[PDB]
Design a protein around this ligand. Structure first.
Ligand SMILES: CC(=O)N[C@@H](Cc1cc(F)cc(F)c1)[C@H](O)[C@H]1C[C@@H](OCC2CCCCC2)CN1
Length: 393
């Protein structure tokens, strides 16, 4: 059958890009104050700029909201990239291109920050979509999505289609372009092709999953599967890269270098610091390998795999000389806090965060970037044994 799209009001409600984040429009307070908010499945606090900042064009003004409630408590959140400090309160919140509901939610009003806001990102806050376990100050601060589900009839699920352009976008182009969809309360069948395959959420804190095998162009990386999930593996729209545990990163880059060895790239490229450029239209996608991550299935002893292309893990960037060349940075990097399946990997797929059934679904995205010879893929099943042993304790 033809796939129908039943969530038209929410399709195309995101803007942004992998490097600076994808955001959704929200309103806070009464009368409504419109703010653009970063969608972050890797944290659990809803927070907004609430004081002037050189990178903010607007911010939440609590004194102008008749529905604001002061919780008289400070909050601090330290992320990988940056950090902020603020003041807790609650207020009425809505998503204009979302469900037609208004809920009272916890809001951290950011008063101080460091390396948090991004110049020209066009967002002024963050929506942490993960679970209360990782909320600051503690798990008693109910996250936004929990409030939404408790106060309304919205089903306990959301899905994300992050759309990478495959070329650079300046601030103006981001403003005028659609960056994807966040479907709150459902799955929109127009956003993917093929089947949805589900992996269990191991524990409800981050959106933690278990990787059981890694291949580079079909070649098994052949590491003990616990290495892939040391000390966790998470699905995170708030991180740009695919980040891998140090040892896995070292093995994967050695394999990616070997597969792409018809061209030599500088160390700075592989360290994700330096861009590489090709003459317009000549990027040699075919010399770079595909990367497959096998994920634990819902059926005992079954796994499935998701496969990405270099069009996902090579992130388009503007040249230092703004020429006609096509330039990119390598968007796979090392981590000391486990695997992070960031935005550049989520760009290949429509990802379903099925909280009700404690599982994450993946399907090939209808907006993934590819070429005439290869596409991203989601395939299965594979008979995989002792998959629970892949989890790190
Ligand atoms: C690059 C990075 O830090 N991304 C942030 C969002 C983000 C985006 C951005 F543009 C600027 C930022 F400062 C932050 C994500 O949350 C990452 C961070 C890491 O979780 C940390 C814990 C710390 C304890 C509370 C829960 C979160 C995994 N998910």
């Amino acid at each position: 059958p033809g796939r129908r799209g039943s969530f038209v009001e929410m399709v195309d409600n995101l803007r942004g890009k992998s490097g600076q984040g994808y955001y959704v429009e929200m309103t806070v307070g009464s009368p409504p104050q419109t703010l653009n908010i970063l969608v972050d499945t890797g944290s659990s606090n809803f927070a907004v700029g609430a004081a002037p900042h050189p990178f903010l064009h607007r911010y939440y003004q609590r004194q102008l909201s008749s529905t604001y409630r002061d919780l008289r408590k400070g909050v601090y959140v330290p992320y990988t990239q940056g950090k902020w400090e603020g003041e807790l309160g609650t207020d009425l919140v809505s998503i204009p291109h979302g469900p037609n509901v208004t809920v009272r939610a916890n809001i951290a009003a950011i008063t101080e920050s460091d390396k948090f806001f991004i110049n020209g990102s066009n967002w002024e806050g963050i929506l942490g979509l993960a679970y209360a376990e990782i909320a600051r100050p503690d798990d008693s601060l109910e996250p936004f999505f929990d409030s939404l589900v408790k106060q309304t009839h919205v089903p306990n699920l959301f899905s994300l289609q992050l759309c990478g352009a495959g070329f650079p976008l300046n601030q103006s182009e981001v403003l005028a372009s659609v960056g994807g969809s966040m479907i709150i309360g459902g799955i929109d069948h127009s956003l993917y092709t093929g089947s949805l395959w589900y992996t269990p959420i191991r524990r409800e804190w981050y959106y933690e999953v278990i990787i059981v095998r890694v291949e580079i162009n079909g070649q098994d990386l052949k590491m003990d599967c616990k290495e892939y999930n040391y000390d966790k593996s998470i699905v995170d729209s708030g991180t740009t890269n695919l980040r891998l545990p140090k040892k896995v990163f070292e093995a994967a880059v050695k394999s990616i270098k070997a597969a792409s060895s018809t061209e030599k790239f500088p160390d700075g490229f592989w360290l994700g610091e330096q861009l590489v450029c090709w003459q317009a239209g000549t990027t040699p996608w075919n010399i770079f390998p595909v990367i497959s991550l096998y994920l634990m299935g819902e059926v005992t002893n079954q796994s499935f795999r998701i496969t990405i292309l270099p069009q996902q893990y090579l992130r388009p960037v503007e040249d230092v000389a703004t020429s006609q060349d096509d330039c990119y940075k390598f968007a796979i990097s090392q981590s000391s806090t486990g695997t992070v399946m960031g935005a550049v990997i989520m760009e290949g797929f429509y990802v379903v965060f099925d909280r009700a059934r404690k599982r994450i679904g993946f399907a090939v995205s209808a907006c993934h970037v590819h070429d005439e010879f290869r596409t991203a893929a989601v395939e299965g099943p594979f008979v995989t044994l002792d998959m629970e042993d892949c989890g790190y304790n």
